Each structure stands twice: as structure tokens, then as C-alpha cells.
Design a protein around this ligand. Sequence first.
Ligand SMILES: [Zn+2]
Lengths: 114, 179, 83, 126, 181, 68, 52, 53
Amino acid sequence: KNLAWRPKMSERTLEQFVPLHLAFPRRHPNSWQERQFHLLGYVKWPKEIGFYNAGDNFELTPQAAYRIYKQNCDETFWTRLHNEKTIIHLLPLVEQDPGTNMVLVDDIFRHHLK
Amino acid sequence: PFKSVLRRHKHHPEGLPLYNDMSKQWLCREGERWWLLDARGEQLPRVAAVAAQYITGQHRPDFTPGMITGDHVVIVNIKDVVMVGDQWIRVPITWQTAYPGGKYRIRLTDMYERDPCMLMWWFLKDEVNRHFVRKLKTRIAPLEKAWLYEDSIHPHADKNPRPLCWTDPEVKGWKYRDP
Amino acid sequence: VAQFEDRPQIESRVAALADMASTVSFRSDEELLRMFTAISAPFSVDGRGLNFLTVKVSKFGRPYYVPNSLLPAYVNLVDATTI
Amino acid sequence: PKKDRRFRVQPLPSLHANSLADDTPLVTTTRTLSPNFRAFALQDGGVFFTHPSHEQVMRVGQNILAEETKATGMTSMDTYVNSRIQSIIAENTVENVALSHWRRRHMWNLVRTHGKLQRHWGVSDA
Amino acid sequence: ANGLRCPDALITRTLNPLLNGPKFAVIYCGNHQYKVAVGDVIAVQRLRVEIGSHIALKKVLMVGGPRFTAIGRPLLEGVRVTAQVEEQKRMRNVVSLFATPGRRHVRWVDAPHAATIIRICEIFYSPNVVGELDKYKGELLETFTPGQHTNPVYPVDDGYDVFRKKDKEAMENATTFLDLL
Amino acid sequence: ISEQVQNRVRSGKELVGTVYQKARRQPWAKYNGMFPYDYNGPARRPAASFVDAPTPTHNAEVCGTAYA
Amino acid sequence: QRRSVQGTWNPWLWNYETERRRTEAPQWRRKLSEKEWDYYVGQYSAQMKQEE
Amino acid sequence: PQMVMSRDELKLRCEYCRFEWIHDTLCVRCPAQPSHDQREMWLHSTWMWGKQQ
Ligand SMILES: [Zn+2]
């Protein structure tokens, strides 16, 4: 009869308070995080290639993306959306140095148009 | 007799001693060092085990059973401690009060509601009592060398706790086996 | 300070402290130095600092120790100083 | 039958089956001071290890401690620890009395009282 | 002590000063292993030896100084451990008492444990070394240089693991001195 | 792969482009319970490895944040 | 009597050692050489190719 | 609702009857004619270990 531990309420009243969808005291330890990374077929890449940024999002590096383009220009699976995605990846480079990156955009442009 | 009948008691105003501040034959504080255990993501029971062994003094090569010499472990982030699967909801904590009605069956979730710190204290109690039961001074004295802080704010900057780098070798999740 | 030294008895000590803890803010710096000097008299670094013990209470198994009115007097001095 | 209360060894990281292959020992110790232990081959078939001495290892420890505490300064625990490394390197003997004893007896240097009863380094007949 | 011996000169002149000063040995005697110093006293199980005699001990598991350690695979050659028989006596009685609850039979068995008490005099060591030995890759290293680490040792941080627990950065980048120089 | 296959194959069963969405989101209605990989951990798969990668020249140099 | 020739274990002699690696680390953040660029981009393009 | 011995003994009796999940326990609910409701007999929604095996 401590009431901090065994309160005066029936289990019928109290069973609504049992969390079945439990959030904060989490069920996933740290040791698993890497393992569950591997089973999903994901691959750790070096910083040049890309990375998972603050929102845990995998963003592909510019000058990394352009090389992926220059390997994959003529590939069968390479669709026209891949080109515009590549160009989208090049934009910060476009602003911070327009002289040497508009040539890249024009390369993708001409190659796409042919 | 050797051990007296007039004994220090909980209702007696003299009060119960703190073994950290006590000076006794079997208490050596000279060669201890302070550790920092971040509990984020690590399973409660495992953390309890590691902490229990630093605290008890078993991690030393010169460790002797009757000589209690521990390291102070500052266990930080008790709130983020991870218990696997349904266990938060299914793992009991049972104790028996001596009086009519000797059963308190209380879920981990409820103990976590009241204090998160009491969970870590509970499993520390268990992992220390696993090797020491039969003498009170050997049970109680180590436990005071745990400092349980449920987030990243602690008074102990002055002891320069060294981050205790530990990875649990056990792959599987903890398993509740208690008869 | 005169009342503290000239009448060494317990009640005059308490009586001195209750006045000089009422008036802490209303005096200067050096006036405090002579105060703490006067008050630090019955204290030895080796000895226990604040123990003033009067009654031995043997009521329980192990004897209890009860202090006299000087303890909360000194403590009230420190808390006034705190304010 | 009673519950077994003997002490239990901690679990140790599981092997990846690479250990099974001969010429690969399953003890993995690659540590800071490792390269200093030099192995030589005796005629007997036994080995001969060359290692830095006790005080050299502890001096290395002291250098690492000082080098980690150069930034934020030295905390009290660091102070006590550095003191003890510095003592145990130069030891020449064994220490049987509590470290605090000297401080407890010399406390009168720290806390000075009024000048009537003030204790000095010479006292009697003065 | 007759000094260490090797077909290489540089290794001999290098490890010659290494063997000077107090040496401890690990000795197998009567199924009991002993850590042995120069002035140490041990009680071995009873040896049949006259008192005040002068003894050499054959089985020697390990010998080391403050500086060198020679680990015998199972045993070592060249080690001279000279001790001196001091006493031969029976030590403190262990009384065993056997009584069966069903039977009235009580058996009092005294076990004074007979022992030879040994004081040690010398520990000398004179190995024959073959060559420097590479420990990460198994080989006998042909050329010996003291200044270069036989096996250099590298820090663990890839950046690849986010959940790797960080010990303080000065512990993780610390390079260790050259000892043999 | 499978969801991309679901996307780029025609809409015969369900509505594309329309705001109705015949199959309504009901996360609470689904299975609530723990699988054996919720206890024993995620199942072990071979660690993803790089064969025959060229040696790391400039391993001492740090990568600049590539925003340039 | 008890004696140590090398010295007695004290808590601080092995304390300041950390775990180390046999062969040096392929740091995550590092400037890729050209052969390295080509190989890695090759790998990424390979898995992207098979997926698509 | 009537509790069937296992999942196999569970049938859909009407047109409007559905399979639903009560916290990992498979059951059948009819929005019309509630007497058609069937539960698979299994553990309580809240159970501890010592309390329920
Ligand atoms: Zn129906």
C-alpha cells in the first residue's frame, strides 16, 4: 500500500497505461547499427564519393557525380533524368566558379542533345 | 562477542555510514582512478556487468576478495539505455515486503517512470550480489562507487573521468532467465 | 566582541552571535575582520571544528550525541554572512 | 546444491573463423608499447624479449598524461596521478604509510589562527 | 652472466648492457613453480640434501631482468641458479578429521608437511641468440638494425565507424620512443 | 529496386496522380509484435568489401569539404 | 618474502596505452589519388548499373 | 468474442467480416452482426514473464 508502486487502481483501469508502442527507451543498441547497415546492402564510401549528411541523407559529392557521368555517358541504363540529376548536382560548383564549371554543363548538354 | 549486538541501525539517529568516506582496514582508496561510462545505446544489463566489475575492483590484476578496492565509475545517460525488444514491457522486477501481502510485481517501465537511475542501481545490485551476498559490507561498499547520472550533466569534471571504451562482445540481445 | 570574550559562558556566546548575525550588512570590511578574529578563538585546526556537545543520549544501543545551542548559533552566523 | 559464486571471466569478442587457419594466433594484442618488445630467437628454441624498463614505461605514461592535459590544464585528479607516477619512477623503496597522513599532520601550515596561540616552526620558550 | 653469444656482432654489443643487474627466474620444483630472486627464500617440498649444501636448479622456465625477458618454451639452457639449503623441517600441522555420522569411528590424521627451506645465492644467464625475430610476419630477420622498429604500429581511427568509442585524443595519437638507441 | 519497379509499371490496381489513394495508410492496424531479429539482432550478412583497391596515396592529407 | 625485480604493478603503468592496428588505416576522409578515383567511381557505377 | 483454438479453426462467416490484428493476435471482426467475432486464443495483451510464463 505504498501507492508509488502499487497504486489503488484496478488492472482493467491500468492496462491502458501499458505502452505497447514504445518510443524513447529504445530497443536498438549501438552494436547493431552497423550490422543492420550491412544487411541492407549499403556500402561505406570515402568522403570524396559521398556521405550521409546532417539529416542522415546520402548526398553524392559534386566532382564525384561528374565522374560517374563521364563513365556512364553512353550506358544503356542511363536515362535522360540521370543527366539532369547530374547537372543538378553540379550547381554549387557552377556558382563558386562559373568559368570552369559551365564547360561541364555544356559537355552534358551537347552529349545529351546528341 | 566479536561482532557486537548493539548495532548501527536505520532508525537509529546515528545513521548509516557512507563507505566512500569511511576509513577501515579493508577500504583502500589510494590507487583508484575515475572512469566515464557513456550508456547511450548500450544494453542495461551489460552496462551493469561492466560497471559492476570496475566498481568491485575485479578489473585489476592484484584484486583480492577481502580487500575492497574499486574504481569510481560515472555512468552517464541512463535515460538512453537500451533494453531489447519487448523486454521493457515484459521484464519483471519482483520484491517481497514482510507483512500481509508479500508481492510487488513491477514492470521495468514503471521503475523507469519513477526513476531511470533505479534501474541501473537494480542491475548493479544484481551483478554485485552475484559474487557477494553472505556479507553486508562486501555487498554494500562497492555500490557507492557508482555515480548514476541520467544525462550528460555531472559534477565530476574535477576528477577527469577517462572515457571507458568498451564494446560488448556478446552479439545477441540480453535474455531474461530468472527462476 | 567584548560580550563574547568577557562572559565566556554559552548563553552570552549565543547572545553575541545573534546580534552580530543580525547586523552583518550594516558594518564595514575591517569591522568584519575583528569579528571573525574574535570568533575564531576557540578553534584548533587539529581539533574538530564545530563540535559542541552537551548531552549523551544512551536511549538506544549505541550512545547518541546531542549538541548544545552553540551549533545553530555559529551556523546562523554563516548563513547571515551568506545572505 | 548451491549457486556458484566463483568469479566469472568477461566475454571476449567472437572469432570470424580466420583464427582456425594455422599461423594465425587467436590472441590479438596490438597496443601502444607493442613495437618496443623485440623478439630474438635463442638456440634452445625459446625466445628472448627486449623491453623498456618499468620507469621508462611509466615515463611514457607521464608524457602522454601531460600531453593530454596541456590544453585544458591539469585537474586535481591529474595532479595527484602525476605526483604518484613521478614518485613511483624514483621510488627506490616501498611506501607503507597513507599519503594523506603527512597532509593531516601539516594542516597547521594551511589554516592560520589568531596570533595569541599561533603555531610556528619553533614554539617553546617564545 | 659468460655474456650472450651470437654470430652477429652488432646484436651482441646491443644486448650486452641489457643483461646487467638483478634477475628473476621461474623455477619448476616438485610440481611447484617459484618466482626466484637473488636473496629470496623459498620452501620447496622435501629434497634429500644435507643442510648447508650448495645447489644448482635444473628446471628453469623463464629468466628476466628489469630490461630483458627470456621466455623458455618449455625449458631454458644456460641458466645458472645457485641456491643454498638452509633448513629441513616439517611445517605447521594440518589436522584432518574424518568422522562418518552413521559409524562411531573418528580418525585424526596429522599432516605436518615436510619441506626443505632454500636460500638463493646466484642467478646467472648466458644465452646463445640466433637472430632478430619478426613478430607480426613470422621470419628470422636477416639484418638487424636497432634504430628502426622491427614492427611499426599504427593507430586505429578510420572515420569509417561512427559508433567507435572515443578514448582521449592524446591516448590515440601517441608514438613510442626508440628503446635500443 | 522493388518499389521502383512498382512505380514504373502501370497503374492498373491503384490510383496514380489522384488525391484519393484507395489503400489508406494504417500503420496502427498492422502487426505489432517482435520478430526474432528484434531480439537476436539483425541477421548477419557478409560485410561489404572492396577487393583489389589501389593503395591510399595522400592518406595523410585531409579531404576539403567539397562544396567548391 | 615478496619481491619484484622489474617492479610491482601499479594502476598507472599500463593505463595510458590504447589499442593499435597492425597495418595503417585507410582513413575515411582523405584525398583520393587518380587511380583511386577511377577504381571507386568504377565500383559505384557498377552497382548503380546492375541495380538500374 | 469466441476464442478459436488456433488460426486454422478461424473462418470468415459473412460478407463484411475481416481479418485484423490485435497486437500480434490474429482475430476476426464484423462491423455488422458482432456475434461473428472470433479471437485466436493467445497471451494477454499485457503480460510479464513470471506472471505469464
Ligand atoms: Zn459475421
